[PDB]
Amino acid sequence: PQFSLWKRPVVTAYIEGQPVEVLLDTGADDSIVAGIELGNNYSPKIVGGIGGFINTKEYKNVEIEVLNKKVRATIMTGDTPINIFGRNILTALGMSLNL
Amino acid sequence: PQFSLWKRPVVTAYIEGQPVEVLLDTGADDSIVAGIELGNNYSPKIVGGIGGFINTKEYKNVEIEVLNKKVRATIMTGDTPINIFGRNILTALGMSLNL
Numbered sequence A, B: 001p002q003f004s005l006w007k008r009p010v011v012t013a014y015i016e017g018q019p020v021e022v023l024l025d026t027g028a029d030d031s032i033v034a035g036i037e038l039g040n041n042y043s044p045k046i047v048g049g050i051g052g053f054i055n056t057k058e059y060k061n062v063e064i065e066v067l068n069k070k071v072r073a074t075i076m077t078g079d080t081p082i083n084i085f086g087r088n089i090l091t092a093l094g095m096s097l098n099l
């Protein structure tokens, strides 16, 4: 699957079985999701954007299913308007930017 | 060119002859750059991400040479910690996201 960027590259993934829409982001070093419960086992992390900082709850070894593919990675959780799949997940999946 | 996503997909662009290092970003709707004087006629705007928003200057029909191509597009200027080329530019170069 090849995505032209005319529209945002958005897909449906299941995080630990819960379905969500995520933006596949080659401009995010990290993945951050909002409104899903991931559990008690996390670490406070502080994160940056264009806008400014945000504090997140950091989950590791999270079961992800996206694009007919199974991965495990670090998910952070927080106040994010759109949910984002960064370069850590993208790499694990085998995606690439082409020209 | 293909960009594995292991490291940030960064490249050298010339914006009106000035060289710049930029982020190729599938999760950026707008293109935003710091430290170039693009001049006088612009339009007052805002740009936001994670953490919040910032004040920008919107210029139109800027000349850019990147990836061995020549485009003309809108670039904002503002105090971004990293220069970003969003989907508006990527779409002009004919870049795609693949798996």
Ligand SMILES: CCC(CC)NC(=O)C[C@@H](C(=O)NC[C@@H](O)[C@H](Cc1ccccc1)NC(=O)[C@@H](NC(=O)c1ccc2ccccc2n1)[C@@H](C)O)C(C)(C)C
Binding pocket: A023, A025, A027, A028, A029, A030, A031, A032, A047, A048, A049, A050, A081, A082, A084, A086, B023, B025, B027, B028, B029, B030, B031, B032, B047, B048, B049, B050, B081, B082, B084, B086
């Ligand atoms: C360290 C943790 C990670 C967390 C993502 N942060 C980074 O890797 C830093 C990194 C970064 O923040 N990358 C993510 C960026 O790619 C984010 C992703 C995104 C999309 C949509 C909504 C929110 C956020 N995009 C952006 O910052 C661009 N934003 C948007 O396209 C965008 C779209 C819709 C929105 C709706 C409401 C509020 C904000 C909205 N922002 C901006 C350039 O125009 C730098 C500063 C280098 C670009």
